[PDB]
Every structure is written in C-alpha cells, then in structure tokens.
Design a protein around this ligand. Structure first.
Ligand code: Q02
Ligand code: CO
Ligand code: CO
Length: 304
C-alpha cells in the first residue's frame, strides 16, 4: 500500500477493550461482523423518524453525555500522548456514564472513538502513535444510552501549529455553524451542502464527498443522508422532531479520499490536511437545538 502522506499506523493495537455486562448494548455489539440488523432493516429508505417527547429526552441525555466525554478527550490533547491512550480514557469515560461507546465493534471497528490526524479525513483508529507538536487531531465521540446514540466531534491543535492549520480548522468550524444556522423546519437537507461548500470554496479549501451527515437516534446511522457539498440530491425536508448530524470535512488540497488497508482510515489522496466538526441537531420551531453543544463555555476547544 502506498500511503498518501507522512502518517503511518502504529501497530500492534492493544486487545479490544471490554464493556461490562451491565451496560446496555446496541444490536451490532454482538454481531460477529458488527452488522446492525435494525439499520439494515431500513436500508435504502429515505423516510425520517419523528421523535416523541421521550425520544427527545433520551437524545438530550445521551448527547449531553457524549459532550462530557469529548471534553475529557480534549483535556488530554498534548504532544506525546498516544491516540490509544485517548481512546482508553474515553472508553472508561463512557462506562462511568453507563453508556456504550457506539463505535465499538460497529461493523468491526476495533476501538471506542475515532482519532483522525492531519491527512486523515475521518475514522482514524486509535493506535500507538504519540501526538506530535504541530499536528491537528479530531476526536469523534459517539455514546449509546437507553436505546439512543449521541454523536459529535471536534478538531484540536497539538501544541503550536502553523497558519494553514489555524485557517483550515477555523474555516471548517465556520462551515458547520453556518450550516447549523440555516436549520429549521421547511428547509431542504440538500441545501446544507450549498452553504458549506460556498464558505469552504471562498477560503480555498475543498469539501469531502464520500462521507455525509446522518440521522441518528435509535440507530447510529440512518435517514436522512446529509451531503456537505453543493448541488447534491439529498432527499427530505426538515421538520420539527427531526434529529441528524452535520459533520463537514474540509481539505487543504483536493476533495478525493481513499481508505487505508485497515478498511476504516479515510485519508486525502493528496496527503494534505483535513479537518472536521460535528454536532447532533434537533430541529425545533424557531430553528434547531444543538444537542451536543458545550454548556459551560462559549467556544470550541481549539479557540480557547
Ligand atoms: N462517529 C463517526 C463514526 C464513528 C465510528 C464508526 C463510523 C462513524 P461519524 O458517524 O461522525 O462518521
Ligand atoms: Co461522529
Ligand atoms: Co456522525
């Protein structure tokens, strides 16, 4: 395999971390190939769930808990720490909150969160590599609690980084937030990409096409599919009681992605850097509720 950048996986991975039996497990957690029966039973479907008042409370709880765990990860970001060490604390943080780390054995994903460095677009696998000063790193957290999934991510700076790094991360965060700002009932899910790409384009960056935002509640990934690029044909119109993520990945170079031999790690084909931010959103009447927002601080971790 020809790597696209300087990054390399650092093996071996430590043995798969166990989740105590008292933690309620999603269906794929015990399927040999990590397949989710309930998600497959809605494959190809474009209809979107309308969340009941108990659904909403369940989503509000699990998303708040997911934010707490990402905050834990944020606190460990410094040169010298390995992505495996991050993952360990995260796994322990989920358990403490009586939640299952949603990525664990999700279609055989071997870890409890995704750690994506530099040219990794998303789905990086936590490994033995020490974070290096100058790196950018995204931690993607998804928790499972009482039948509901909560999903968010932030890109972080590792010590001091360069101007391009600062620009890429700030612009990515802006794309998300401008997208979130347009969310309200009656809006077409396909419009979000127009907004994201418009801002990415104006700053000289491209927008990944192979990965999309998604509905999320009783399923990890479900309807609607939410592309981050312009002129997409996403099916659906926003409604009060809809819950989905927006998670634009933006790149320094071109938009083309490819996957490592591990079957998960998505990297820019040109080896240039990529950044991502993610929130889970609930559409209300006056707009939307950012379920994965910080409660105790105004800004994302990278600008504070
Ligand atoms: N939370 C991410 C994820 C984690 C593990 C497996 C697949 C996607 P995504 O849905 O934000 O891409
Ligand atoms: Co995520
Ligand atoms: Co997601």
């Amino acid at each position: 395999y020809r790597y696209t950048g300087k990054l390399r996986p650092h093996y071996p991975l430590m043995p798969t971390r166990p989740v105590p039996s008292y933690i309620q497990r999603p269906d794929y957690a015990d399927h040999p190939l990590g397949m989710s029966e309930s998600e497959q039973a809605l494959k190809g479907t474009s209809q979107i769930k309308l969340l009941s008042s108990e659904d909403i409370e369940g989503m509000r709880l699990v998303c708040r808990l997911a934010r707490e765990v990402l905050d834990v990860a944020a606190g460990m970001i410094k040169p010298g720490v390995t992505t495996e060490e991050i993952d360990h604390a995260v796994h322990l943080a989920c358990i403490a909150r009586n939640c299952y780390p949603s990525p664990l054995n999700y279609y055989n994903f071997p870890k409890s969160c995704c750690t994506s460095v530099n040219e990794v677009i998303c789905h990086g696998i936590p490994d033995r590599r020490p974070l290096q000063e100058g790196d950018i790193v995204n931690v993607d957290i998804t928790l499972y609690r009482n039948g509901y999934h909560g999903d968010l991510n932030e890109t972080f700076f590792v010590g001091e980084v360069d101007d391009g790094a600062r620009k890429l991360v700030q612009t990515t965060y802006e794309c998300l937030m401008q997208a979130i700002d347009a969310v309200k009932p009656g809006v077409r899910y396909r419009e979000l990409g127009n907004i994201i790409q418009k801002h990415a384009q104006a700053n000289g960056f491209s927008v990944v096409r192979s990965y999309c935002g998604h509905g999320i509640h009783k399923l990890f990934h479900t309807a609607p599919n939410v592309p981050h690029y312009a002129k997409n044909k996403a099916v659906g119109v926003m409604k009060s009681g809809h819950v989905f993520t927006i998670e634009p990945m933006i790149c320094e170079g071109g938009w083309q992605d490819e996957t490592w031999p591990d079957g998960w790690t998505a990297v820019t084909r040109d080896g240039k850097r990529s950044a991502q931010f993610e929130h889970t959103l609930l559409v209300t009447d006056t707009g939307c509720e950012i379920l994965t927002r910080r409660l105790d601080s105004a800004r994302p971790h990278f600008m504070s």
